[PDB]
């Protein structure tokens, strides 16, 4: 963890957390030096596609 701020996505992706998937609502209003995305990340909300 030290000395770089690490935020673990757990069951979340950065775009999903930005949009506000319910499961990701924990990461709201948080900052990071390095964001970590897990492979098991899944979305639980309206089908979203981002060009």
């Amino acid at each position: 963890d030290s000395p770089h701020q690490i935020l673990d996505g757990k069951n979340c992706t950065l775009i999903d957390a930005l949009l506000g998937d319910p499961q990701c609502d924990g990461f709201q209003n948080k900052k990071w030096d390095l964001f970590v995305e897990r492979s098991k990340a899944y979305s639980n909300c309206y089908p979203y596609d981002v060009p």
Binding site: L19, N44, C45, Y46, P47, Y48, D49, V50, P51
Partner: protein, 51 residues
Amino acid sequence: KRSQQTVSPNIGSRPRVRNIPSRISIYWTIVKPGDILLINSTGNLIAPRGY
């Protein structure tokens, strides 16, 4: 003031994801220090809540 982004809704059936055939496309717009975001919509608008 700097740029315009126009997107036309496309209504059609699409493969079911999480038992939801409809979808949502997400786009981003950057607003400079002195600038105005003007949104013209007659329908099908998923709207921002803040910045």
